[PDB]
């Protein structure tokens, strides 16, 4: 069955990147939307568009620079089977600072750097290189 939605989304994104797809649609969720927004902010996707009332579809628009993909790698870190929380000192540096680590904090989802700045840790959703 479907157990992780965030993970699924990530996978979809990865596959889109692989297959040189312009856009990647999926069922929406709030967390997912937040993640997408974060990605956009960080500059790994062009745009995201949530669309529908009853059952709304998120639709990301993947980014390609000089032929190849932008989202070079993208892993789920915490996952339902085995969660990962991190205190603000323990927050990771993905690709030695070049990549980002999406982290859910009490003041919302944000990139690792942002979290650090704030002075708070949290659940580490995904790494994006």
């Amino acid at each position: 069955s479907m157990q992780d939605p965030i993970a699924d989304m990530l996978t979809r994104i990865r596959n889109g990147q692989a297959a040189n797809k312009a856009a990647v649609t999926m069922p929406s969720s709030k967390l997912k939307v937040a993640i997408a927004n974060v990605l956009k902010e960080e500059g790994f996707i062009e745009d995201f568009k949530v669309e529908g009332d009853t059952k709304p579809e998120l639709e990301l628009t993947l980014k390609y620079f000089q032929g190849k993909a932008v989202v070079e790698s993208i892993q789920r870190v915490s996952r339902p089977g085995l969660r990962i929380y991190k205190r603000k000192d323990e927050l990771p540096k993905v690709m030695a600072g070049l990549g980002i680590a999406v982290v859910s904090t009490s003041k919302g989802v944000m990139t690792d750097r942002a979290a650090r700045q704030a002075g708070l840790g949290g659940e580490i959703i995904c790494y994006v290189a």
Binding site: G81, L82, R83, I84
Partner: protein, 80 residues
């Protein structure tokens, strides 16, 4: 402002007494999975108010028996 634990009542057969399983959601040392570990406690209760499968709040006290060193403070959700 007293240290008090919640838990379900596993059994209430022995008189003026109950046994209360207290669940705790500890992280594993090595693997980092979060396990539900369980702590059965023999708790004293005068009047025998608690039924089985009943959620109940308990505090630590001086020992009332061999195995019994906790006393209940209130009952919650006693539905059957």
């Amino acid at each position: 402002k007293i240290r008090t634990l919640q838990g379900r009542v596993v059994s209430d057969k022995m008189e003026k007494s109950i046994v209360v399983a207290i669940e705790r959601f500890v992280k594993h040392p090595i693997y980092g999975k979060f396990i539900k570990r369980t702590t059965k406690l023999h708790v004293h209760d005068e009047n025998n108010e608690c039924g089985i499968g009943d959620v109940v709040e308990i505090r630590e006290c001086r020992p009332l028996s061999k195995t019994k060193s906790w006393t209940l403070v209130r009952v919650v959700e006693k539905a059957v």
